[PDB]
């Protein structure tokens, strides 16, 4: 059955709750973003109202084939009424179309559900600043002090200078970026922009990008692999074997590969700055691991919550074991004692 952390008290609303069949009482199913963990169970066969951003609705329509009658897209930063209750969607700074949701309950309680998010100080001057938030449903993916990472901008600058150098040294090199879902598009679009190229990719991946309301998209991407010097491949192919195999496929148009694996955190975040990073190399193929995160670091999460001062926190990630829950509760009390709420 649907867990309490996916229900919104005193409404018949749920959030990211599609894998449990019909939820008893639920009149509106919200979807924060188009990642398979959150949408799991949604298909062309679902027949209840789904509320979501415009981007998320394009994806539901075109990738999952959910029927149009059941998709209710809502604009951002706008007060809307859903089944008699006032809501607002805000940018989550996660992947394309990902939202936080603000619910104003009839009794006067205010609830923020973050979805998946990367907390940022620009969220301190949104509609959130205008009133007290009593309850916070929080993306606790990286809720432990070991989880540090560079800014997105530091990582992109590094990727740009690295790719530009390699291709100026060898104008027959190919750049490859690994991918598995939506998100982290800036990695490949920034590399392509410094090399004066479009990004080549499969038909399924191009169809996905074409749903994302990215300005000038038709000038940036193509299905003609031949004509482009940045290619996208599935993350699973980003290894020496997969990359040599792909290089054979391209018809001796390239004689070298430089590949990027955007990942979350891995244990080498604890010593290495972005400027110290060096690739793994085997022959004419080099692979760079780059920690481009679309989740809050510990410090980013802590700052956001210390600013917001919620009366209660409801974790939404890593809630499956008592040890994880206990650990997280300890950090929430620390934050509250430091900040005086």
| CA distances for 49 relative to 26, 72, 89, 90, 277, angstroms | 10, 7, 17, 20, 47
Alpha-helical runs (H) found in the chain: 36-39, 54-59, 152-169, 185-195, 203-210, 240-249, 298-308, 322-339
CB of 38 to Ni ion, least distance (A): 6
**Which lies closer to Ni ion via its Cβ, residue 35 or residue 198?**
35
Interatomic CA distance for residues 25 and 320, integer angstroms: 24
Which CB atom, from 97 or from 150, has the smaller least distance to Ni ion?
97
> Minimum distance from CB of 257 to Ni ion (Å)?
29
Least gap, CB of 57 to Ni ion (angstroms): 17
Please answer whether residues 297 and 142 qualify as being in contact, where contact means their C-beta atoms are separated by less than 8 angstroms. yes
SS3 content of the chain, % helix, strand, coil (to 5): 35, 25, 40
3-state SS, residue 178 = strand
Smallest distance, Å, CB 100 to Ni ion? 12
Query: Tokens 């001057």 map to which residue?
Result: 125
C-beta closer to Ni ion: residue 143 or 174? 143
CB of 117 to Ni ion, least distance (A): 9
Tell me if 57 sits within 8 A of 73, measured CB to CB.
yes
CA dist., res. 159 & res. 194, Å (int): 10
Nearer of residues 158 and 265 to Ni ion, judged by Cβ? 265
| 116 or 185: CB nearest Ni ion | 116
Min. distance of Cβ 31 from Ni ion in angstroms? Answer: 11
Our CB check for Ni ion shows the closer of 137 and 158 to be: 137
Nearer to Ni ion, 116 or 300 (CB): 116
* Residues pairing with 14 in the sheet: 7, 29
Residue 94 C-beta: closest distance to Ni ion, Å = 6
Other C-beta atoms lying within 10 Å of the C-beta of residue 237: 14
Nearer to Ni ion, 232 or 317 (CB): 317
Answer yes or no: are the C-beta atoms of 292 and 177 closer than 8 Å.
no
In whole angstroms, how close is the CB of 141 to Ni ion at the nearest point?
9
Q: Quick one: tokens of 116?
A: 């998946």
Chain residues that interact with Ni ion, rule: CB under 5 A: 35, 116
Whether the Cβ atoms of residue 154 and residue 186 lie closer than 8 Å to each other: no
* 56 vs 58, beta carbon nearer Ni ion: 56
CA 149, CA 311: separation in Å to the nearest integer? 28
CB of 224 to Ni ion, least distance (A): 30
Half-sphere exposure of 93 (CA within 13 A, CB side): 19
**How much is the CA Rg of the chain, to the nearest whole Å?**
22
For residue 127, the 8-state DSSP code is G
């Amino acid at each position: 059955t649907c867990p309490f952390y996916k229900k919104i008290p005193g409404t018949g609303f749920t959030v990211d709750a599609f894998q449990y069949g019909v939820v008893e009482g639920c009149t509106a199913y919200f979807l924060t973003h188009f990642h398979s963990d959150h949408y799991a169970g949604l298909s062309k066969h679902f027949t209840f109202p789904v509320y979501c951003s415009e981007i998320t609705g394009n994806l539901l329509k075109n990738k999952l084939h959910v029927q149009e009658q059941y998709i209710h897209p809502l604009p951002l930063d706008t007060e809307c009424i859903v089944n008699g209750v006032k809501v607002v969607l805000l940018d989550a700074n996660h992947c394309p179309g990902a939202v936080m949701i603000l619910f104003y309950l009839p009794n006067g309680t205010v609830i923020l559900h973050t979805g998946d998010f990367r907390a940022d100080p620009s969220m301190e001057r949104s509609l959130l600043a205008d009133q007290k938030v009593h309850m916070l449903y929080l993306d606790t993916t990286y809720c432990s002090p070991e989880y540090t990472f560079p800014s997105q901008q530091e990582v992109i600058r590094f990727a740009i200078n690295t790719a530009f150098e390699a291709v100026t040294l060898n104008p027959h090199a190919l750049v490859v970026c690994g991918t598995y879902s939506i998100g982290k598009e800036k990695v490949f679009l920034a590399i392509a922009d410094v090399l004066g190229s479009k990004v080549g990719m499969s038909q399924e991946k191009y169809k996905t990008l074409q749903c994302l309301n990215i300005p000038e998209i038709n000038s940036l991407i193509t299905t003609d692999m031949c004509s482009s010097l940045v290619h996208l491949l599935p993350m699973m192919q980003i290894n020496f074997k997969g990359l040599q195999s792909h290089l054979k496929k391209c018809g001796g148009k390239y004689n070298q590969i430089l590949a990027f694996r955007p990942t979350g955190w891995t244990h080498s975040n604890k010593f290495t700055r972005i400027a110290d990073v060096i690739p793994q190399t085997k022959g004419n193929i080099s692979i760079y691991g780059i920690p481009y995160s679309e989740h809050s670091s510990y410090l980013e999460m802590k700052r956001f919550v210390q600013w917001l001062k919620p009366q209660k926190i409801i974790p939404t990630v890593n809630v499956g074991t008592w040890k994880s829950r206990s650990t997280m509760e300890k950090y929430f009390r620390e934050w509250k004692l430091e900040a005086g709420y």
